[PDB]
From a paper:
The [name]-containing cullin-RING E3 ubiquitin ligase (CRL2VHL) complex is an E3 ligase commonly used in targeted protein degradation (TPD). Two cullin-RING family E3 ubiquitin ligases (CRLs), CRL2VHL and CRL4CRBN, are commonly used in TPD technology. These CRLs are members of the multisubunit RING ubiquitin E3 ligases with a cereblon (CRBN, substrate receptor subunit)–DNA damage-binding protein 1 (DDB1, adaptor subunit) and von Hippel–Lindau tumor suppressor ([name], substrate receptor subunit)–Elongin B ([name], adaptor subunit)–Elongin C ([name], adaptor subunit) (VBC) as the substrate receptor–adaptor components. The VBC complex exhibited heterotrimeric structures of [name], [name], and [name]. In addition, ELOBC is an adaptor subunit of [name]/5 E3 ligases, bridging a substrate receptor subunit (e.g., [name] or SOCS proteins) and cullin proteins (CUL2 or CUL5).
To determine the crystal structures of VBC in complexes with coumarin derivative compounds, we attempted co-crystallization and soaking with each of the 25 compounds (2–5 mM of 25 purchasable coumarin derivatives). Successful results were obtained using soaking for 7HC_1(DE22) and 7HC_5(D3), and co-crystallization for 7HC_2(D7). Similar to the previously reported VBC structures, four VBC complex molecules existed in the asymmetric unit of the crystal. The 7HC_1(DE22) molecule was modeled in three chains (B, H, and K), VBC−7HC_2(D7) was modeled in all four chains (B, E, H, and K), and 7HC_5(D3) was modeled in only one chain (the K chain). Met105 participated in hydrophobic interactions in all seven [name] structures of 7HC_1(DE22) and 7HC_2(D7) (chains B, H, and K in 7HC_1(DE22); chains B, E, H, and K in 7HC_2(D7)). Hydrophobic interactions between the benzopyran moiety and Glu102 were missing in one [name] structure (chain B of 7HC_2(D7)) but were retained in the other six [name] structures. Hydrophobic interactions between the benzopyran moiety and Glu64 were observed in chains B and E in 7HC_2(D7). Ile65−benzopyran interactions were found in chain-H structures of 7HC_1(DE22) and 7HC_2(D7). The 2-oxo group of each 7HC derivative formed a polar interaction with the main-chain carbonyl group of Glu102, and the 7-hydroxy group also interacted with the side chain of Glu64. When we superimposed our three 7HC structures with the VBC−MB235 complex structures, the ligand-binding sites were identical.
Author numbering:
A (entry chain C): 63 to 132, 134 to 141, 146 to 172, 178 to 200
B (entry chain B): 17 to 47, 58 to 84, 88 to 112
C (entry chain A): 1 to 80, 84 to 100
The structure:
Amino acid sequence: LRSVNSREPSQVIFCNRSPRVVLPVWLNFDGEPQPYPTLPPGTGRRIHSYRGHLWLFRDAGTHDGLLVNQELFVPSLNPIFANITLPVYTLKERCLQVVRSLVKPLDIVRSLYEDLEDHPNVQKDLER
Amino acid sequence: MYVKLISSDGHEFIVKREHALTSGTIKAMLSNEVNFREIPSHVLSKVCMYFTYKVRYTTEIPEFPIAPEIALELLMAANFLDC
Amino acid sequence: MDVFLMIRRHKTTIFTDAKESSTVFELKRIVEGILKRPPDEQRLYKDDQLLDDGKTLGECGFTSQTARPQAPATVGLAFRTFEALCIEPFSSPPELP
Ligand SMILES: O=c1cc(CO)c2ccc(O)cc2o1
């Protein structure tokens, strides 16, 4: 999973249709994730990218996964609109998100202990 | 077609059959009433709200609200029901 | 537009949707199919206010933007003389750990 060094400019608008602070992540030519400045909720940003480049987006504070144009965003030939939205989380994952935000890293089963500690992470999703 | 989901404290929630089939655990318990000995009403009502929320949004999608007081119990129920 | 409701009486709660243009009587028909009671033996309430069979749900304050799927509006139900409106509250959550 890497960006194609096409050198063909592609105009892109990062549109945050989510209540989260979106963190854009660019996968460089070696697959390494590169973070870009964050987007407050409901805000947009015109950015300069290239054709064949790879972008994914997360919650800047918790790294929860987000959808762009309903996982990976690849700028194509022209600007292209990147609609970042909340996915329909599972009720379990949604509960884990809320509990994670109220407790620092409980009368719960040992299996759910590891679920709370298995934070969302870009490197883990990249292997997936 | 509707099914009945009974909480631990006796509350009887009547939701659409296809809504309840979202949880694989509930489909096994139906194959039409289900009694939940471990899930109180203030948790099971949120689960049913999630069924409608999931079927409707699966337009911009709003956040599913979870009050902090019910987060831990809803987590255990969601883990058991695998939804 | 769809409105999302909890029709509640005693320890019963029905999760269903309806059109904002549908009438109170048509909602009683939905209840009839589920609880096997005719509309003439049903009273519907918004909080404490009795709803008239001819008025649409939108007229009664059940709008698509307030009766949301993740937070549905509550319609009180009362069966038949007519019993008083009784809605058993949900259990109380424990103290915050
Ligand atoms: O809502 C609940 C609350 C608990 C415990 O408080 C609970 C425990 C086990 C289970 O399988 C489901 C549960 O659901």
